[PDB]
């Protein structure tokens, strides 16, 4: 039962050694905007060098896997394989492919509330999209992602497709909002999904953290022992909660959304699924336990 203790000294050395792998969130963890967290690339290098598997699990639905790979390299993280990158965009594409395979050749299209990156990810998996060139099939799912073009007319159109009870409703994630470098915030997919759910009378299947589906997506490709895996994230309600549901050890890093006082709040209220096992000021602190 997590005590939100500061990981350092010998415990830090033991916990990492036992680890088969570390799961990292990206935003708030490896970088903030275009500023990387100092030490992070070096940390990743030393991890790989010590044979510890690294995967990246993000709720960000804006970037398709190729463009995510380029961001990593451009920001100084070399030697990443694309196979290591799991976004809500990617796993939503895969979930939708599997729920729509059906025997019927009469595949439909997905109506997407989101950007080019999310669309690209779905096309990469082989899905057809409403609004692409040519005839438009029957819309068979609405996908809600991070959608800067969100509009009343697009909400209305989403709801029309949803009047067909066989049309599925999927959301990339429910993050409510995200911090921007200038100090402001942008609404998250979770706010857009709440609108879509309310106007259509439906509940979405949610793909991203803290939904376990994300772990399912990851385990289709890699063998993961949750008991020997660290989940490292900056956000208690998505990263930590996810980690607990999957049985992983959880590390809150303090370079992002949540504060230690938010964690200690939850601890005192006994909501243990939101209490990290450990915390660090930044992921850089983890290196003292390595060589």
Given its own copies, Mg ion, none, residue 149, with its beta carbon under 5 to 8 Å by kind, binds its own copies
Separation in Å, CA 148 to CA 114, 115, 187:
7, 7, 9
To Mg ion, the closest distance from the beta carbon of 233 in angstroms equals: 6
The site string for its own copies over 133-152 (x = CB under 8 A, - otherwise) reads --------------xxxxxx
In the bound state with its own copies, the residue whose beta carbon lies nearer, of 159 and 218, is 159
Given Mg ion, its own copies, none, residue 203, with its beta carbon under 5 to 8 Å by kind, binds none
Whole-number Å distance between alpha carbons of 66 and 105: 29
Q: How many CB atoms lie within 10 A of CB 157?
A: 17
In the bound state with its own copies, the residue whose beta carbon lies nearer, of 91 and 155, is 155
How buried is residue 202: exposed, middle or buried, by Cβ count under 10 Å (0-12/13-18/19+)? middle
> Judged by CB under 8 A, does residue 18 bind its own copies?
no
Given its own copies, Mg ion, none, residue 155, with its beta carbon under 5 to 8 Å by kind, binds its own copies
Q: What are φ and ψ of residue 142, in 5° steps?
A: -110, 130
> For this structure, is 239 an active site residue?
no
Q: How many CB atoms lie within 10 A of CB 225?
A: 11
Alpha carbon 23 to chain centroid distance? 11
> For this structure, is 25 an active site residue?
yes
In the bound state with its own copies, the residue whose beta carbon lies nearer, of 18 and 198, is 198
Q: What are φ and ψ of residue 239, in 5° steps?
A: -70, -50
Query: Catalytic positions, please?
Result: 25, 27
Tell me which residues touch its own copies (CB under 8 A).
147-152, 155-156, 159-160, 163, 176-177, 184-188, 190-192, 194-201
């Amino acid at each position: 039962m997590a005590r939100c203790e500061r990981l350092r000294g010998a415990a830090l050395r033991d916990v990492l050694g036992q680890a088969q792998g570390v799961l990292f969130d990206c935003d708030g963890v490896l970088w903030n905007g275009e500023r990387i967290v100092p030490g992070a690339p070096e940390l990743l290098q030393r991890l790989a060098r010590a044979g510890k598997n690294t995967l990246f699990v993000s709720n960000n639905s804006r970037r398709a896997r190729p463009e995510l790979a380029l961001r990593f390299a451009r920001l100084g993280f070399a030697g990443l394989r694309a196979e290591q990158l799991f976004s809500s965009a990617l796993c939503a594409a895969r979930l939708l492919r599997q729920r729509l395979p059906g025997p019927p050749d009469a595949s439909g299209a997905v109506f997407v509330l989101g950007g080019e990156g999310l669309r690209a990810e779905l096309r990469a998996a082989g899905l057809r999209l409403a609004g692409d060139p040519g005839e438009d099939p029957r819309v068979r799912a609405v996908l809600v992602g991070y959608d800067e073009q969100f509009s009343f007319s697009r909400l209305t159109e989403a709801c029309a497709h949803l009047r067909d009870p066989d049309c599925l409703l999927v959301a990339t994630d429910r993050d409510p909002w995200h911090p921007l470098s200038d100090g402001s915030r942008t609404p998250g997919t979770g706010s857009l999904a709440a609108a879509v759910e309310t106007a259509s009378g439906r509940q979405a299947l949610v793909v991203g953290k803290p939904s376990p589906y994300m772990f399912q997506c990851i385990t289709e490709d890699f063998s993961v022992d949750p008991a020997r895996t660290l989940m490292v994230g900056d956000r208690l309600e998505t990263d930590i909660l996810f980690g607990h549901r999957c049985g992983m050890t959880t590390v809150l890093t303090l370079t992002g959304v949540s504060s230690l006082e938010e964690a200690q709040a939850y601890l005192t209220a006994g909501q243990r699924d939101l209490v990290p096992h450990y915390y660090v000021e930044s992921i850089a602190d983890l290196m003292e336990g390595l060589e």
